[PDB]
Every structure is written in C-alpha cells, then in structure tokens.
C-alpha cells in the first residue's frame, strides 16, 4: 500500500463521487473521549453500548451517555473536520459530490459544516422512546433533573441508581415511556433507511477515504473494503495501520488533522 500523496492527488482532482468514512480517530483529535481502548469508571463503550446493559442497568447507561453529552459542550471541530466540510462545499460547486459517512455520534461533523452526513450509529443528541418509538432531537442539559450532577467518569463513583421512573421520560402527550439514546448499540442493527443511503453511496462511489477508523467495528469496517474490491482506490488516513489497511491503495499515516488539509486541498 502506497505512501505516495502525489499519486493520491491525481485520483483526487478527477473524482466526482467521493465517499469519506470517518471513525473515532477524528473526534479524538478534538479531545472527545472515545471509550474504545479510555474508560468510563470501570467500563468501555463496548460494555455499556449494549441492549443488555440498558435492560439491567438503564440508570448506569444513562449516566454514561449523560456524561458524554455534557462533555461535548466545550468541544469543537478540528482541522480534519473543517477540511472535510470545506472540500464538500468547494466540490459541490464543481458538480462533484462528497458524502461523509460517520461512525461517530458526537455531531462534530455537523458543527463543522458537513451537509451530506450519514450518522450510521445515531446521535448523542437524539433520544428514542422505548414505548412509542418517536425519535426526538434533545440538547437539554441535563436531559433530566434526576441526572443533574451525575455521570462522573472517575472510578469508584457510586451508581446514582435513579429509579427508572425518574430517568428521561417521553414527553409526547399520554406516553410516559422510558427514553433511550438514539444510538446503535452492539447487538443491534443499523437503521435500514440509513443502510440504503450507504449502499447507494458505496456503489456509485468514485474515490473512497477512510479516516481515523481502527476498522474493528462492523459493518462500518466492510464499507471501504467493499469499494476497493470494485477496483476503486481507497486512501486510509490513520495514525497507525489496521487489519484492513493492506486491502487499500493508500495508507497515509499521521493525525488526520495533519494529512487531510493537504490531501483535500
């Protein structure tokens, strides 16, 4: 796998549908904690982003997401996020399409300007009622009163054990259902409406970029390998090589913050 930028820029100037797949690597450059290995108390994302964790300890899970929600307030998009958003505006005007498909739930791509955004794992700032299924944007801090001054990430912190009745409840008239985060947990499926948008993007894709992904979360991990198999060049921008890198035309190492501003110039 080549480490040559000049060869990349030659495909880049020509490409007309470009898909960018973005992973936790991009958010970690904003100082957003990706709990992917690092921990929230004695747990990582894999232990809490599960339907089982929510069934058995919904209080704990909400504490965790509450933490993550509040932490985002200070945080901002980085040079990698900006470069991708500028590129999409710039290329838009040349009749060229750019789409970002993100594994991230922090919405930093939105804040940066990105319009053609597919959030394959949902968002931190959307809830879903487990009684009626309405999906609602929710930016309220704290999301519910019983969570005010909870969600500390330091281990040893005792569980607030908020009864289920005082965790975020649906506000729809007549419902009262328990809300969950509208995030895709391990063991669950991605939204079918989202999967079709992606299927189409990956099929008619042009040049694929995979940025700050460790390439260990499926299905997102298969998306670029899909494209490469079709004879389409794929550039992997990551600080460190992955289990999929050897299937890609390019690997550029570095912080996506350092490499993308050039690559997408």
């Amino acid at each position: 796998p080549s480490s040559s930028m000049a060869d990349f820029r030659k495909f880049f100037a020509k490409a007309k549908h470009i898909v960018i797949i973005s992973g936790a690597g991009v958010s970690a450059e904003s100082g957003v904690p990706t709990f992917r290995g690092g921990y929230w108390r004695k747990w990582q994302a894999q232990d809490l982003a599960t339907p089982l964790a929510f069934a058995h300890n919904p209080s704990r899970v909400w504490e965790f997401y509450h933490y993550r929600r509040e932490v985002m307030g200070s945080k901002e998009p980085n040079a990698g996020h900006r470069a991708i958003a500028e590129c999409e505006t710039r290329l838009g005007k040349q009749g060229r399409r750019v789409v970002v498909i993100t594994q991230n739930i922090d919405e930093l791509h939105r804040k940066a300007g990105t319009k053609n955004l597919l959030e394959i794992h949902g968002s931190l700032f959307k809830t879903r009622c487990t009684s009626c299924g309405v999906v609602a944007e929710n930016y309220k801090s704290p999301i519910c009163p019983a969570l005010s001054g909870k969600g500390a990430p330091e281990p040893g912190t005792q569980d607030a054990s908020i009864p289920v009745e005082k965790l975020p409840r649906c506000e729809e008239a007549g419902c009262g259902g328990l809300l969950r985060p509208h995030v895709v947990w391990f063991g669950e499926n991605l939204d079918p409406a989202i999967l079709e948008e992606v299927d189409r993007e990956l099929a008619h894709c042009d040049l694929c970029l995979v940025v700050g992904t460790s390439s260990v979360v499926y299905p997102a991990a298969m998306f670029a390998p899909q494209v490469a198999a079709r004879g389409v060049p794929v550039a992997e921008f990551n600080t460190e090589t992955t289990p999929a890198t050897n299937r890609f035309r390019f690997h550029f190492q570095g912080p996506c913050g350092t490499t993308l501003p050039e690559a997408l110039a």
Binding site: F186, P192, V216, Y218
Partner: peptide
Amino acid sequence: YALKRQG
C-alpha cells in the same frame, strides 16, 4: 451484515 459488532 447490518448487525453492529466488534472483532
């Protein structure tokens, strides 16, 4: 295919 999973 659609299942979220690690590995």
